[PDB]
């Protein structure tokens, strides 16, 4: 079955793995952490032994049963490890701790009479009928009698490509928690896959999306039900909920609660809140289902776009490049892809929007339509360019030996070959500073800033700073 079940820590939205707001560092460096900043210099790393994973333990067990605690998701065991290396620098969405992906080997029957059910050493074989639609919609294909291995989840779908790990490569992991202080493991890599272009199953939310704004309210419903289920009182105080929203004052805290609870003026319950029974109390176990880990991960992908947008606004002197990023914002891009998937729009397929820089990927930017016989002509060229790009894409990622299969492995991208290093004005920044110092004479320094990235940042602050008005 293609039904996705995550581990328990994932469903629980376990802290610190899942947060309401991540620091901007983790937005700026997305799923990219500095391992060297968290090891104290002089530390001697000695490797510990792997905990044996009994086959009987996970035999005929569900995911959440197989992984009940964060300790079940350790790399400090003998369970095979799969490394999914993303070809995209900025994939649509990634998975957070505990979340499950399905490795699906799609096989399509050559004919109705096809009895074959091919098995690859890893992943689950899923048979596609002859008239069955493509798992990659109209942008990818599984040919009859062919297998196309695929990364499957509720957020994205992407082709994967198994490769050999260099015999020099190993996985060094650092583990701590469960009453135990940090220790290290050194493992062989069982499997290595290159993940192809990520195709969104679901849109990435926008900044002012009602889906995002409503999460704050849902996080409240959440806590309210939990507190109620604990005391059974059906009448509680607004005091223990307020500590979960340190930013909000008495007025805000009250206002937010009245979307759910009503105030008791007179009685034994006076000075307390009962929930309007227009809302039905959920048990604690079903209260977890109110927010999915996919939902959170989707918002972080959104916040990454937002962070990169404002990181560009301040520091990017390149007008043309800045404008490109604005057109590549994930909430837009992903949306247009879902449209094109429903024949409600089209994508450019090539050019600047291609995340590869060569022709080895898809551009998701929107293009116009599409007369009568002229649209059938354009459609044919469209459907052809798609298939053309798809096979170039999959062939490019199926490369075992770079130097023999690639045209020029050491070639340089268009966008990496020619970069704009100067302003439009070709000007620089001259700063004159007068600082009374030395316990004496006023000193004057004159400074020149040749870095257009700094120049742009300096001005933008000064510009907004120059306003103390209104």
């Amino acid at each position: 079955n293609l039904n996705i079940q995550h581990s328990q820590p994932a469903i629980n939205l376990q802290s610190p793995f899942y947060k309401v707001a991540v620091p901007r560092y983790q937005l700026r460096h997305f799923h990219r952490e500095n391992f060297g900043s968290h090891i104290r210099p002089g530390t001697k790393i000695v490797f510990s032994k792997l905990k044996a994973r009994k086959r009987k333990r996970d035999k005929g067990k569900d995911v959440k049963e197989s992984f009940s605690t964060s300790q079940d998701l350790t790399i400090g065991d003998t369970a095979p490890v799969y490394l999914m290396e993303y070809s995209e620098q900025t994939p649509v969405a990634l998975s957070k701790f505990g979340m499950a992906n399905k490795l699906i080997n799609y096989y399509r029957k050559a004919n109705e009479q096809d009895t074959l059910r091919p098995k690859l050493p890893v992943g689950e074989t899923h048979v596609l009928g002859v008239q069955d639609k493509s798992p990659f919609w109209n942008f990818g294909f599984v040919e009859p009698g062919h297998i196309v291995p695929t990364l499957y989840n509720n957020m994205i779908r992407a082709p994967v490509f198994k490769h050999d790990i260099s015999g020099t490569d190993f996985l060094l992991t650092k583990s701590s928690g469960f009453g135990i202080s940090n220790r290290f493991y050194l493992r062989n890599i069982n499997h290595l896959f290159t993940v192809g272009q990520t195709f969104p199953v679901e849109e990435i939310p926008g900044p002012n999306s009602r889906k995002v704004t409503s999460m704050k309210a849902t996080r409240l419903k959440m806590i309210i039900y939990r507190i109620l289920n604990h005391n059974h009182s059906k009448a509680i105080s607004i005091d223990p909920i307020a500590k979960h929203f340190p930013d909000q004052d008495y007025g805000q805290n009250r206002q937010k609660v009245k979307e759910f609870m009503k105030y008791q003026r007179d009685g034994p319950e006076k000075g307390l809140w009962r929930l309007k029974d227009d809302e039905k109390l959920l048990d604690n176990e079903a209260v977890k289902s109110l927010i999915t880990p996919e939902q959170i991960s989707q918002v972080e992908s959104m916040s990454q776009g937002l962070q990169f947008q404002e990181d560009n606004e301040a520091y990017n002197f390149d007008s043309k490049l800045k404008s490109l990023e604005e057109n590549l914002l994930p909430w837009n891009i992903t949306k247009n892809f879902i449209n094109s998937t429903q024949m409600r729009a089209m994508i450019q397929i090539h050019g600047v929007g291609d995340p590869t820089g060569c022709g080895e990927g898809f551009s998701f930017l929107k293009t116009s339509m599409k007369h009568s016989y002229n649209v059938a002509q354009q459609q044919k060229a469209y459907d052809e360019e798609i298939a053309k790009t798809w096979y170039t894409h999959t062939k490019s990622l199926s490369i075992s030996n770079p130097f023999e299969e690639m045209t020029n492995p050491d070639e340089i991208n268009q966008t990496n070959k020619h970069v704009k290093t100067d302003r439009d004005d070709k000007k620089i920044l001259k700063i004159v500073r007068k600082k009374r110092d030395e316990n004496g004479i006023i000193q004057r320094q004159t400074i020149f800033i040749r870095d257009p990235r700094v120049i742009q940042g300096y001005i933008k602050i000064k510009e907004q700073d120059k306003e103390d008005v209104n």
Binding site: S7, Q8, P9, N12, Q14, P16, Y18, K19, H31, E33, G36, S37, R40, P41, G42, K44, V46, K49, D58, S70, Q71, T74, P80, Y82, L83, M84, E85, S87, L94, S95, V122, E124, T168, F170, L171, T173, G177, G179, L192, H244, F245, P246, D247, N284, F308, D311, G357, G361, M406, N416, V419, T421, I428, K430, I431, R433, R436, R450, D451, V454
Partner: protein, 229 residues
């Protein structure tokens, strides 16, 4: 003693739940690449035997470490991969569960006789994405990188580090290739060019240092001028 991590109010979705783990398991990791020496075959055997006594790693610096294998001492540099790598585990062969992400590689370079040779070492197939394409103004960039360089948790530089300060702060740490074959030279080949996060951080600091000097002065003024002079 085991230090139980403190939760900050308003930062969690699992608050008020009973299922809460007090001390959850947090894991991080990087790729470790060693040279195709006769010690590679030693490592393979070690992992097979389960005997890890012949392998140790001394971390000397944020990006510099010493990998001793079978009494042979290796200089290693921690480099940033252009790709993000999801580490998954599976008991199913079918259902893959996410643990942590890998975006770095500890890269063995050459055998060394003394530990402080690592700082003089240069990581192959690496560049400096703060400087690249801006090599004209690289003099202006470097002196800021020397200033900004700090030790563990923002600590002042060691006597060791300050000696090799020029090498440490100015060498490239940004690796060219992914670990998978198709992603060879992916950064220069198969990436459409974007602003680098480590680049943005640098730009941000420079802007800040310039404004902090503006407050420390009495009268200040800035003007956009032509390249002369």
């Amino acid at each position: 003693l085991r230090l139980k991590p403190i939760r900050i109010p308003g930062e969690a979705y699992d608050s008020e739940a009973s299922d809460i783990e007090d001390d959850p398991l947090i894991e991080s990791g990087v790729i470790l690449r060693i040279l195709p020496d006769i010690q590679l075959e030693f490592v393979k055997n070690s992992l097979e035997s389960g005997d890890y006594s012949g392998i140790s790693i001394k971390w000397k610096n944020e990006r510099h470490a010493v990998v001793t294998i079978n009494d042979v001492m290796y200089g290693a540099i921690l480099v940033d991969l252009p790709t993000v790598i999801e580490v998954n585990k599976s008991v199913d062969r079918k259902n893959l569960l996410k643990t942590f992400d890998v975006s770095q590689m500890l890269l063995c370079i050459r055998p060394i006789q003394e530990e402080e040779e690592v700082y003089a070492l240069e990581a192959p197939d690496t560049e400096d994405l703060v400087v690249k394409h801006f090599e004209g103004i690289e003099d202006e960039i470097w002196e800021n990188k020397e200033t900004f360089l700090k030790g563990y948790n923002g600590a002042p530089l060691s006597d060791m580090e300050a000696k090799h300060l020029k090498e440490i702060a100015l060498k490239g740490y940004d690796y060219k290739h992914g670990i998978s074959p198709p992603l060879y030279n992916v950064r220069n080949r198969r990436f459409r060019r974007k602003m680098d996060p480590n680049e943005i951080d640098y730009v941000e600091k420079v802007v800040d240092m310039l404004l902090k000097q503006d407050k420390q002065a009495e009268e200040v003024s800035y003007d956009l001028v032509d390249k002369s002079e």
